[PDB]
Symmetry: D3
Subunit: 132 residues, 6 copies
């Protein structure tokens, strides 16, 4: 799934759309998305002036947006997140977002999310969503 | 503590500085900060086009930035977050960020964070930080 | 009137929409709007680098936009303004915009505008509008 | 006076610096500045989506910034403005800002300002300033 | 052709629309467009911090956009450019873009482009376009 | 060479810095840089609204910035460019910028530039630079 289709599937848009492509999709089970990290993204100017580092909370948003694509291809709001920020992410990194569905019911979903650069895990999370 | 002092204390800057004022400060114990939510903030255009709602992850960042002010007045990176997004936040809301220190050691800190609009709690979190 | 309705009523949009909510409305007579002042608004970076202060001219625009909501609920262009900038406005302030209709005719309107933080008046203005 | 010198003289900066060049300068008396109006300026996206028109309040800010250059070559804050918005200004216009000093004292200054496109006057104003 | 019509004719939009007006049009032959250069355009902050100078590549884009208007009034993508950057362009300059059609076929077009400030040539280019 | 060092070496900055990392460096001979293409870069909103495609002129700027790093490690202004835009570039692409020095003299330099996604060439250029 390329960016033009991602734009349609993800309700977020610039400057808060943090998916570039879908790499792998197993409906009702798992998705793998790609987000390129670029020094020309607007948030880097503020985090931090002396040192550009991807904010951990935006990796969480990227994992949430990847999940939403998985849900739509199988209004969701993030309801909870339990997240470990293991390693920093920098301009020039390719961020791989892997979502596995834990449990989906009519009203909610719980997923496990892993963000990777290369095959080093930089962020791990459990997320839940409520329909709204 | 007014915004000009906040600017100095918080290493983040526009468009990723999410504190306006410090309302209450008890060194080594607790801080209460204020963030005004304005429809003229850049993230609202992308979250969401049809419906401006404050992203939950940016409330987490605001709680993390409030914590950093508490630490500095008593390089911190968010190391973990366990967060419940209870209620939505809108342009025109005044977001109150309350941080209580759970445990501080030389290398890390664990805090409990509550975000409120009025005296309704909209977000509750446990956050941990590592020195870097 | 909440922000989603304000967005529709006010033709301006980001980064030039300076109303968050309507607090009070008496058709054909008076309106009270709220604009949250946030350090994360784009104009603060340029006014001024060393010292964030709300530009007086944007308080005038906010008063003009509040007036337009009053007109619409009872293409307007600001035709004249006679304004006194009494006190400065800062990130973290809640700006209250009070408009009283002086005279409305088919082609024009003259209003008196008061901007307040708390119940201190920070700006007072007489504004006129022409239909266009 | 070219833009690089204007940048230094005017404390405002992007996105709130509304002078490009100084065309004429008579110390203690009069200044003529130029501001190019470009469709690629950020405020046009919001004023208005269907129709790009220069906001009258930003012409007032440009007149105020021209005045400040005159003062500096002979912290000023706009204290009052009495302004008539006669004609609209569009992308592609060259806005000429003419300031004549009415009265300068140690604490304040009163000026008359005229904004022109070609030699048609689009805005006329009396402005006052207080030292701060 | 004024900016509102330019907006419709040129598929690019803010922050990548670099035409303000069409000054002269001879269908199937030549066009002259105007782009005002303003210090309040977003690219100047990054090119360069110490010294605002219009990037040569954006003059090429402006010449390409002028060409597209000529084509439409008589999806085009720039296919090739052979360009000489002779003189620098600054905030406050009025950039005149002159396009002469060399050869148009069903699938492609080759044009000669000249950018001028006053009647000094600042950029000269041969451009080709392919339909897409 | 990582982004923090790139920031220092390249005089351009956000929103006009189009290098993320240096991948390969042979002083006085060749450089290979990486620019991640992200849908969250500000230029995509304007090029084009219906269809995000990297502007060819910004690939030229990226090649020019890669060249400048090569020059500095062995004020440069682009003096000429002769460029072929062969294939389009999209959000999610990793753009590889390869510069080979043709000739360097005290006053000028001529280089050959190739931009690649994967190992498909998307842009080829000859560029010249003059010291300034």
């Amino acid at each position: 799934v390329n960016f033009e289709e991602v734009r349609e599937l993800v309700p977020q848009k610039y400057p808060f759309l943090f998916i570039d492509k879908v790499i792998e999709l197993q409906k009702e089970a798992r998705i793998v998305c790609l987000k390129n990290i670029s020094g020309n993204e607007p948030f880097f100017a503020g985090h931090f002036p002396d040192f550009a580092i991807m904010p951990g909370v935006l990796i969480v948003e990227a994992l949430a947006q990847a999940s939403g694509i998985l849900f739509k291809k199988s209004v969701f709001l993030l309801a909870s997140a339990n997240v470990r920020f293991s390693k920093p992410v920098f301009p020039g990194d390719q961020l791989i977002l892997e979502i596995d569905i834990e449990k989906v019911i009519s009203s909610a979903a719980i997923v496990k999310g892993v963000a990777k650069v290369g095959d080093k895990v930089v962020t791990k999370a459990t997320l839940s969503f409520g329909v709204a």
